[PDB]
Symmetry: none
């Protein structure tokens, strides 16, 4: 029915934007160009649970800085980053695995996520997403990016105990 | 996909009342008389949208004592005390010669979802029930009662409403 | 399970404080002392869903408050107001309904609710409750009094669909 | 100096919008269409101080609004309401007072104030004003409409002591 | 120095009205009839303080149409429509046999400063004028109209008001 | 007295969870995977005040991340971390210290704290705790984790001056 | 049209202040005096979108702190910083680029931006700007510095999709 | 008069607490014990102006970590830190210079500032100060610690332009 949240039976894969989706879009920088971002332990918990349930996972980012890959390492899920066209990378990634895009949940926050949203069955915007992104999503989290939005999504799929 | 509605996309604006033009609160006295708060910014936006030639309607399930008074002030028709808003909307569209695809409908709660399904441009206020926020084609940044309709008016008519 | 939210299986009755619980604790007054309060349509929906589900309902208020009686009539649930002691009135009411207090959910916000909290199995504080009351509760809403706290509780019992 | 706040030396008149400027833009309504609005005691104090200081005062509102006239009486300042065009009424009012529009401070919040802003030397937006209005102003309050924005402006003119 | 007032420090609690027990807003109708919002938590706190035996008073400069009605509900005396609150307070202290040093006075604005000077325990609400916040001996964390008196009651009587 | 806040007479020990309790549950990470967390100076002052009052202190954590020990070092309080089962570690520690679990205050924020909550007399949830944890607690702070929740608890136990000053406002030695 | 927001037709250049405009005006400092600042990825996307649209870009700053250049490097836009007089540097730069100051958008937050504001056609204050700066501006963002104020400005100029997608929602190449 | 803010003629010295007064009381830490804090550029501006006006300045802290001294170096003002008793250090500091404590402005936020407050003529609390500290101050800033509270204080002493 219209507006229904995704369930475990609806999806085979979870693809996550990084900055602004797993973070609050802020980046700490030094004079050398080193970057730091804040991630949320609740998201860690949610991602670990989704991973353990057998879902195919990906972090997808246009950002070249290795900080995204450092987070991906901690979470033990694949990362594709420094990609010019997010949507083309996503299309190719689905086709390499024979995954139906209709059974992909993709989480984003800004306008460079919109072409990905159009490709997949379950586009999800974090609460802090920009206007047109919030609208284009099939579901919207109540928790903002960097505050545990991915844990909230994990609870939709796996239930409140994250079983 | 990443597009707010524009004046070229729509011929009608249909508005829920409680929780969309209000914050979903009702002030009550000892007799059970009811009062609600509306927003003057919404009034300004509604007047600009009406002046631009858009066909407008307020649609509500409440025997709302006050919605007819508000409609009268805004100089737009009202249909209220209806258990099937979607059928009322469909009937109104037919009577007005307006295609549902060209209707912007603004709501906040689960009883708006059947209306959302019928129209081209379902819009949720920021304070909408979680499922309604997702179901909408666009979502306002300001909540019901705080000028959500005023914000929609600027999407359609520009920041100066001109 | 420690901290578990109540479900339909756990409760036979829902008893509600009024000011601060179904309202933000404010009262509009005129020169003659006439009182007006703000209630929430979402609470109205949640209360109707709980009533429709067959739960025995009650509003309890210490002072004779004609505004509470007006609200109760609208909600189609009984009210006991103008009573010496909320907790004793509640105890008598349970004994008469044949209802185990262990299966009563009572919602409150301030220290005058503590004797009721001690009597029932499922004391619930609204988010805006005072410190000691938040602690004394078995569950605490995320939504404050007058903002839809009762609708939240209704969602615990009946699901986010309210059925 | 670019961006300087107005002082007593700069202005001969203070003209005030009502809804959204002296209020939070909300209107309480009943079934008969009777209207009620909330005004701020701090604004009352600020307005009395400006009036006492000898400044020529006026409230301007497009619609015939009996509530605005009640407020104006309390404040002991005149009101022009039920007028075709705010800006033309203002222009005529200035011409009659003998006051240079360059030395008029006008406070507003929405796009219907822009013609007035264009006419006067000191257009002032309340903090809660809409984007284009905040920009169009010569000064912007930090306090929103209905929260004491007029008292803030009175403090610019007379000091935080209001004298 | 770093001490909130306790029951042993005071014999009286004197309360300003607008902006202290209210958010300083007034609702008006077309006739100029005035309505204000008070707080039930404040009511509970005031009742506990009164029950503990503290001598209490509301003091206001407003011909406030509604302050006498509120005082009547709270079962405490009121003095209002007074241009010199400080002299009213001094007179009341003399009549009550209460030493000003043992009075907790709660206010929010510059017209409270002369009262602040007379008493041992001047308290500003969080939303007080900037100078009044500094002038006070203690400052509440909650603003006027939001339960500032309820918060003071817990300083004097403990979190459970017992 | 239902809902009463803990006082100095009620407790002999204060045991603290770390992430989400002394922090906002976020981690700052750099290009190379180094982790940083934000703690609060108010918490630090509260913890030192509790320690000076003679309460037995402890930070308890599940994870290997050495940042917790670094915080514990600065605070001069012991750590029990990298632990398989948190609650068992706590039960054993209580036994070994000769402290009755009924007189232990434990502060936490997440569902993995619930077994510790069940063990102790005074479970306390930070304002930002998971919904079920706020309910399960005997007391709930108003201030969230990383924002001075432990400083708030310290004021429940020691009063508004953290026992640094007496009534008349003079410096407390001891 | 009084108060109108800038559009693509109004401007040929976008010049940005740094601290307080692309940041929240705070600096993170460590035990050894190293300085860090927080910038915003939304601003980064907005800036790149403006640059791709053919607007001449520039970051202008008074201070020697090299962090600004590091940001400018990542954004692929020139820096003019460590400058004695900001406004003179800007007037000269406009002249040298063949850009009329009336078609320059300058974003700032503090009183030292007022002379630049006077120079240009489209001075813009971030929401968090000093009170006099908010007044002096021709437009004021709703979002504060460091929170995506430049991303907001980018949406004024390019629309809600930042010109990455057309009406019908297809990818814009050019 | 009661509650009056300090002026330039009232004071000869400004002594500043660090954590929570020039910061928001947060500290970023690594596994090695390195600390980072966030300071505000507005405070930098205000402190530079107070320094240039000829006031004797000090940053005073019980914190042993060198981060406080790094900030003091950037601001070019003396620091005394790692001090056991803040109040005793302050008393000694005043006496070494023959400064009257009545003409000292001291800014703080927490209970370890109270004995310093009692020593000086002009104790000032930042807006975010703890309850008893806000009360004990002679003046309270409107801006919280780490948000430009010292700039606000500088404006009291030197005027809005910080001349
Ligand atoms: Ca992103
Ligand atoms: Ca509705
Ligand atoms: Ca949608
Ligand atoms: Ca209540
Ligand atoms: Ca509990
Ligand atoms: Ca207006
Ligand atoms: Ca301007
Ligand atoms: Ca008052
Ligand atoms: Ca004081
Ligand atoms: Ca934790
Ligand atoms: Ca700057
Ligand atoms: Ca400090
Ligand atoms: Cl994690
Ligand atoms: Cl209206
Ligand atoms: Cl209802
Ligand atoms: Cl008034
Ligand atoms: Cl009451
Ligand atoms: Cl610390
Ligand atoms: Cl970026
Ligand atoms: Cl600085």
């Amino acid at each position: 029915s219209l507006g229904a949240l995704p369930t475990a039976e609806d999806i085979d894969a979870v693809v996550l934007d990084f900055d602004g989706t797993q973070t609050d879009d802020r980046v700490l920088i030094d004079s050398d160009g080193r970057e730091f971002v804040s991630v949320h332990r609740g998201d860690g918990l949610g991602i670990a649970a989704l991973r353990k349930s057998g879902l195919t996972m990906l972090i997808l980012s246009t950002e070249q800085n290795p900080v995204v890959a450092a987070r991906a390492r901690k979470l033990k899920i694949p990362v594709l980053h420094g990609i010019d066209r997010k949507d083309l990378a996503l299309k190719q990634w689905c086709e390499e695995q024979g995954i139906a895009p209709e059974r992909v949940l993709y989480v984003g926050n800004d306008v460079n996520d919109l072409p990905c949203f159009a490709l997949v069955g379950w586009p999800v915007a974090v609460a802090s997403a920009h206007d047109v992104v919030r609208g284009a999503a099939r579901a919207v989290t109540t928790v903002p990016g960097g505050d545990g939005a991915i844990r909230e999504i994990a609870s939709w799929i796996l239930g409140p105990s994250l079983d």
